[PDB]
Write a protein that binds this ligand. Structure first.
Ligand SMILES: Nc1ncnc2c1ncn2[C@@H]1O[C@H](COP(=O)(O)OP(=O)(O)NP(=O)(O)O)[C@@H](O)[C@H]1O
Lengths: 486, 477, 486, 113
């Protein structure tokens, strides 16, 4: 009397639902029955698994094989269930040490020969396996795709016999390949570049250290895009989970989604024309928009006012929710879309000014926390090279990490996501600072949101100098990052 | 003799219809036949049940097994029938004494090892079992979801052998494990003043004003003004939640739900549900608050359907051969924009049908002045609790007068309760001369006046109360 | 060992995905259990292969047979699997030396006499076999269709016994037909048919030069569809890299009589009623829509306002990327649709004008680059006959080839495919040009997208004028092709 | 059956203008009496008459005159009694737009009112 239990994943989409494979060997006539809403693609696993076991010089039981793909309420649309089933059968026949199986998760499609074949949609599987801290074994054909995850806890095999010998004799199998070291280091940006615009640089630094969204404004060719691409270097390095989640969102796009290196916080910048289906959602099938590839990264609304107002209105959903459900029909998918927003606008040179600025999305413009002006450096100043830049990016990055730790000490929310109650409770806002606020806002006719965003920015620059309490100088300097338009 | 009975439950919508699985062992060549309308997930239970019985060291009968899970006309879809069928087979073979399972219900799907596995959407079955005064044995994995009832007799087990020993020798199963703001809105004055009596009287309210001025903030705050849900109401809310497969919060099941649907307004997601039906956004707000953010942006059709449950408390939806109620009692809140001519005329023409006209109350929000915006939160004295006590006593007196709130008063009842003495009648005609309110406008004015009259703890309505009530009217312009 | 492999090709859409046929012999009771998603083979091929093997005097195995058709997640429908399965069975029974199959593909269906029959849709298999550098053996009847590819290493046997002899004895089996030649002669249509429409002709020619999308407007009967019908002859001749792709796309629908016009670009002009499924994508196993036939070619859409809005919404994806990636929610098919788009419309017949203009698709108009108003011919111009027979179409085609060759000697895209930044750095645009362009943009409310479109048209016309840089004269000339609607 | 006390009171029905032809009249695949049939021996109320679609109003003629509706599944024909009394409501709105608005009213249902 014996039975075996084996674990695998069904990749119905971004999520990887855990699935338990169970085999029981009755002493009845040698049938092979499958339960658990097995589709045709998997209900036909019988003969292929049988031949794979036979052709690997194992013994196929002459007994009533019963297979259960739990849970029974969800259909098994995947195809990689074959290797878990074969391993379960071999374990039930006591040809394998059952003790080792408890810690391992298996995915694999086997040809009739017993050699493995690579299934599709493996990135969500490895993400889920890592989050569950399970040793994952997959077909060698998917090692190239698995490599971009940067794991050290995933193993690949060429044939079922190799998996059996790793289980028994500990052959350790072929691990996934080396690091993608074939790249240009420092992302060719690092920091300490951009010779001019000192004020814009430290404004960007404080925005990065916090979580504030910042809108750039200036003349063409003076800045914007350069600072935007440089910003990605200041954000702290992604943990394993964030990198794997970015890989999962990239993977559903199909193919090898992009061999543009990895593990850095993604920068996305859709063109202002684009489309509502490409920026957000997936339309008829479940796909993530560019808003979602920016998850744990930066979304750059390059030339903001040319965007469609409806898309900008939609953008307000996940920026606060953290995900944007796509209620297409009869079902929906989450697709997390939390990102550090950055925007760029051109002031242009009468009625024309209002007629142009009327296209600005007021709800999104009000949500954007920071604004700074970019001056042109003129053709005369660009001739002189960088002249001893003395790269210092690591200090600023560690400052970012320490600042985020300081935020987490109070609450998980960064200063940009603070509500009014928590914001007011955090800034001690002494008597003199209160009088200063009343004076300056008597001077400047701000609204409620303008007042609260000012408080949040002031608190951020207060944390810039390790001050438990805000001071008048902090608010005075933070005041320079507001007063939209003219 | 070789016949057995076992009660269980099947879920279709909110109601957990009773199901009697019946096992008869014949004497012919062994076979496993199942009868009664069953989705293939149910007729696939043969192998799971056989393996579970075998691996639990019982004896699987070598006889004709006929399983009837009646009634025959009701289709069975749930995966939970594995445990009832296993217990029926064990009882029919007399391995388990029959008398022990008389007043019990079994729910759970079986893995091959005989371990019980958690099924989805269990809570309605728990409620039905409690109502029918039956013991309910469930898989251990469902203990977390069933924990939001505090009920006894809900003993849960990990594997089949535990249940077998419990029935045979009485070994105790595991009991179910025990259970684990209005502030700010600076200086808004009139808006919160109106919203307080709106909560008191269950009235629907429409807020007008510029966006980004506290409308959503106050709407979210409105949730804690309502009283805590009773035990039955909280249980029903947990039941409707359990259909969509989540109960991750705790500490909050007693508070009324709050939902803010998006203006995209996909019909099948906002209301009702396709396939085996699922609760919509409207039904998730049961006993709670439904906030129609940006009312004019909604399409006509969804709100036209929504008018019916607003007046009836339920939204009937049906497949070809079914009929589902899906209770949807909720409180309505909506928002609109005053606009800065023909453009404003078409804007107000584009409003969402005569659903706005039967909204009970309306209030115009004005932007905060700067000085109250300065005022630090040194005025943080609690205010939610006292207003909740007011509201609780208010529902108490309103229910004592009649079995409904002032919002749900029928035509004759409101005129019978709102006495409107000669002094008040002498006034109403002059404002019916300054204005041209419809019959329903007059009636909702009367309901609001009655609510305010209660607010002053008055047995009768007075002229001052009607004058105060008149301010919270005059929808649009 | 009772194991054999046999590679082959199957196609959905244009791509001919590789498929590995696997045959395993077992000692159990005689049966033919085919596995892998098969719609016709699973129930028809297992019968034909038996008779084909028997009647060719081979020994059919008196043993259990399991046949695995490659990737299990990919549904397969081509009938030509009979020959691969038969050869797999023969190799598994060691009546054929399995070592010789290492570098070959097989395609064809077997009659009961062992004779091969011509399979449908052979061309994509030939293309895939060549690019994979694989010897391809096909039915004799398919020689005429495969011949247009002209590739070596292709053999067309008559019967299974001939293939067995070639594998065992290496006899020269069959060379390909002797490469039918085109010797292109147009002999039809020609640009000379367009009497009197000087402006429309020059606009049409420079639109061909720049690959721009062009919209025709004006009174009916001015020659709208005639312009489109004659446009195709001005495009450059398709190379084999393009001609083979177009032939593969066309063969998917049915028949292929192109031969002499086989290298000319194709032209489609669907009527506005149509149906979305026939015009784009298709049911059944995926079939190509009316859009995909215009690949590498031209698509004409007269009566644009009368199209149902679904078509005009969906056309954005292929018009941008050259592919549609249509999906059935089970799989997605790329279905390339690289084309040049020509539109035609009547500019309105009161608020009826407002409704008529509102029914226009802005997302399609947004990248409609060229617009020209065509009047009805004048009477005195209509009096004159043709009076000359110079076939100027060839000269215009030569001009188009020259312009496209120079553009490809520049960056890898034509003016039409240039983005904003590439369009910026391509054109010199001295100070006088910039200031005059700013002045004209002040005089009429063109957007930045219209600004870039005008710059693209100006670059095209300047290149046509043999000018090294864009001048103010070229901007003045290009301005006439704008001001859509009154 | 909410019955035994109020059953003898003649039925009342008020279908919404959205509804569905298959549920308002007859029933798909397994036959089931439509919402028109429930008003039998009672009153059927049609608020906002013009907003109904043409096909349903065309089919309304058959039960009004014959007292019954026959639904055909092409395998057999099934009769559902539909003798009822009809009450309708409509309203004009602010020009010749009034003329085209009233033109939407179904001609052969209106003359049977
Ligand atoms: N009276 C007030 N007291 C305190 N904070 C307020 C008040 N009015 C507005 N706010 C602030 O305004 C923000 C929320 O405004 P609110 O308009 O309710 O949300 P919203 O998302 O902007 N609704 P919408 O305009 O549709 O986007 C929060 O930062 C609140 O702190």
């Amino acid at each position: 009397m014996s039975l075996a239990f084996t674990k695998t994943r069904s990749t119905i989409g971004i999520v990887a639902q855990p699935v338990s494979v169970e085999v029981h060997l009755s002493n009845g006539l040698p049938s092979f029955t499958m339960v658990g809403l097995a589709e045709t693609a998997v209900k036909e696993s019988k003969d292929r698994v049988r031949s794979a076991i036979i052709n690997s010089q194992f013994e196929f039981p002459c007994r009533k094989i019963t297979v259960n793909l739990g849970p029974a309420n969800l259909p098994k649309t995947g195809s990689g269930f074959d290797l878990p089933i074969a391993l379960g059968i071999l374990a039930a026949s006591e040809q394998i040490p059952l003790t080792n199986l408890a810690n391992h998760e298996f995915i694999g499609e086997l040809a009739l020969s017993g050699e493995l074949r690579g299934v599709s949609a493996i990135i969500p599987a490895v993400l889920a396996a890592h989050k569950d801290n399970q040793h994952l074994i997959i077909a060698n054909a998917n090692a190239a795709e698995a490599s971009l995850t940067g794991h050290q806890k995933v193993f690949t095999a060429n044939n079922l016999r190799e998996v059996c010998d790793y289980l028994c004799q500990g052959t350790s199998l072929q691990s996934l390949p080396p690091k993608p070291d074939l790249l240009l280091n420092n992302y060719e940006l690092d920091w300490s570049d951009i010779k001019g615009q000192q004020h814009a640089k430290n404004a960007m630094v404080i925005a990065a250290c916090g979580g504030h969204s910042i809108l750039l404004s200036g003349a063409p060719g003076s800045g914007k895009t350069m600072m935007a691409k440089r910003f990605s270097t200041l954000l702290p390095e992604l943990s394993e989970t964030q990198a794997l989640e970015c890989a999962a969102i990239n993977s559903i796009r199909g193919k090898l989604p992009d061999f543009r290196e990895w593990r850095l916080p993604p920068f996305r910048a859709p063109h202002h024309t684009a489309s509502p289906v490409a920026l957000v959602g997936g339309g008829n099938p479940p796909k993530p928009g560019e808003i979602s590839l920016a998850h744990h990264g930066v979304l750059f609304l390059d030339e903001l006012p040319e965007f469609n107002r409806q898309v900008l209105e939609t953008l307000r959903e996940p920026l606060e929710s953290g995900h944007i459900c796509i209620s297409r029909a009869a079902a929906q998918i989450e697709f997390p879309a939390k990102f550090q927003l950055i925007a760029a606008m051109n002031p242009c040179p009468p009625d024309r000014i209002s007629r142009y600025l009327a296209k600005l999305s007021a709800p999104l413009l009000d949500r954007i926390d920071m604004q700074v002006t970019i001056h042109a450096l003129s053709q005369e100043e660009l001739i002189k090279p960088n002249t001893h830049l003395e790269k210092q990016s690591l200090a600023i990055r560690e400052k970012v990490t320490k600042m985020h730790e300081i935020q987490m000490a109070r609450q998980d929310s960064l200063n940009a996501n603070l509500n009014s109650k928590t914001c007011e409770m955090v800034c001690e806002l002494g008597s003199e600072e209160q009088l200063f606020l009343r004076e300056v806002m008597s001077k400047l006719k701000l609204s409620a949101r303008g007042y609260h965003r000012l408080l949040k920015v002031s608190r951020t620059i207060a944390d810039m100098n390790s001050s438990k309490k805000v001071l008048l100088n902090h608010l005075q300097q933070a005041l320079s990052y507001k007063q939209n338009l003219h």
